[model samples]
Target: GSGWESKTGSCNTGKLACCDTNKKVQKSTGEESGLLHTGDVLDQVAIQCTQIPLLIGIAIEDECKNTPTCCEDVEDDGLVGINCTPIPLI
Candidate 1:
């Protein structure tokens, strides 16, 4: 199973939210979720598209820190990938 850790330190910035596998995340839009690196979750959020994918150590990103990030969708299956899309700005 993928490990879980405190996202408090890593996701401190308003720009991101760290969502561990099997955990609930605030789903919204204008944001994207990606997996952490094999090591550091904090620095790893900057990771670009990788060939292979991971289940845990999820991170978030938005156009602006204030923008809503769809983040991750909660699923019984660990394979639940990115869930939604950006909400249109009003």
Candidate 2:
């Protein structure tokens, strides 16, 4: 299969949309887009299968629990490994 790109558009942020295999991600820069860890495949599938509204709710809950840092922390953390440690996105 091919891929898709979601550029940051007019935003000043340097984020770049990426697709490594089927796991789409928005990275801060273009340099790391093509690398895909095997775990990203599993986690992305899980995230996709989760109902959007439910995922949103979880995000909100996380946001509240961690105050201003939850969402950022979770995203920054990326995939959860077997050790339950945060794995880099790519």
Candidate 3:
């Protein structure tokens, strides 16, 4: 897994980072004996662990700036949606 990190100014505490499965090898679609079938797990996990957290950070920062109501709207089918709009800080 590839990762990146960045610190704000000289403070060594606050930072923003992200990682992905850019280093993982993709196997061919052939009938091999020892080949590992690489599904969407790599990308899924990477995004779940990296992008989601970053978005959360952005949401929190936005809330701090304007004190927006960060509520989750749940549907009858158990689907949840955040009421805040995505603010890309990257």
1 or 2: which has the higher lDDT?
A: 1
Candidate 1, run of 10 with poorest lDDT? 43-52
Tens digits of per-residue lDDT for model 1, 1-90: 123222433322223222333433342222223333224332222211111232346433322243232223322232222432233333
RMSD (CA, Å), each prediction: 14.5, 13.4, 15.7
Score residue 73 of candidate 2 by CA lDDT: 15
Measured against the true structure, the TM-scores of the candidates, in listed sequence, are: 0.18, 0.14, 0.15
What do the candidate models score in CA lDDT, each in turn? 0.29, 0.21, 0.24
lDDT by residue (tens digit), candidate 3, 1-90: 112122223212222222222321132221121134245222211111122333332533333332222112211221121221222444
For residues 1-90, what per-residue lDDT tens digits would candidate 2 score against the true structure?
111111312212222111122233433211133144343443322110111122321332222221111111112323211112211222
**Which residue pairs in model 2 clash with each other?**
none
